[PDB]
Design a protein around this ligand. Sequence first.
Ligand SMILES: O=C(O)c1ccc2cc(C(F)(F)P(=O)(O)O)ccc2c1
Length: 297
Amino acid sequence: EMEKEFEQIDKSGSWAAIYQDIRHEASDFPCRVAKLPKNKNRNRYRDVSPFDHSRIKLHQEDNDYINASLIKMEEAQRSYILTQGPLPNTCGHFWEMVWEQKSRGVVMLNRVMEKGSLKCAQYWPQKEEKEMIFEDTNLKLTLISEDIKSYYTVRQLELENLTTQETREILHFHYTTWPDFGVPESPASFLNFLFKVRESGSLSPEHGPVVVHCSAGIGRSGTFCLADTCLLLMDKRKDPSSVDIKKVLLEMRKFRMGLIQTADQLRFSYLAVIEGAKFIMGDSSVQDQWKELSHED
Ligand SMILES: O=C(O)c1ccc2cc(C(F)(F)P(=O)(O)O)ccc2c1
């Protein structure tokens, strides 16, 4: 049971050991394609690559590579696409993936500039009169509207396949206050954001996998996905005790490496899941409490 386990680990102060063991058990699969010479410039970080078995292939005869993985959670029946922050040369690929995978939402857990360095390209339009056109993938992207909150912004975008002129609505959820290798202000702050994504239908099975990313697409992205999945699992069963957080993370790591970068990010995952359990268990009011505590206004 996660809560008793949390108190135990917290009391013993062994989060570092717990986290280290997970890393020791983490799966190791080939990343041959990611390491191919022609893809070097398609990778942001040398040591963060997608496993060949779960990588997302771009539907193009030229080069189907993109540093992105499909985290297909069988038991929970939810899939996510974890990817790195797109590079200046991979923004068109990023949107090609969103189109081809039929994703409705994109969760950005990082900022374009963090710690004096550019951790992601500005792959989306910031002004409605300034739409973006990715000639390479033949896609056009337009900002339609945006809801700016204190620690996050939700943007409504329109992605158009210029080739077929088909149009789709993309919801962009941008958490702006989550430090790399850091954690959210509080479980309330995180859950308020997670539930904002849930309510949009972006995580629903009637859409392609939600695209989740940060700079590397593993730390903050891993934390977001683990919490959501653990909440989903106990939801379908309405049984919090049936969920084993560490086991869930290990299964996720069979699809992409390094999910959850710090022992504190793992610790926070427990906090977020424990708190979120309240809602899952029939206390819908907590959702409003999280909104208050998040100070989104
Ligand atoms: O160069 C590397 O080897 C490398 C490895 C892991 C990283 C993890 C993050 C993260 F955890 F903060 P993120 O949440 O963006 O996934 C950011 C940058 C990283 C860079």
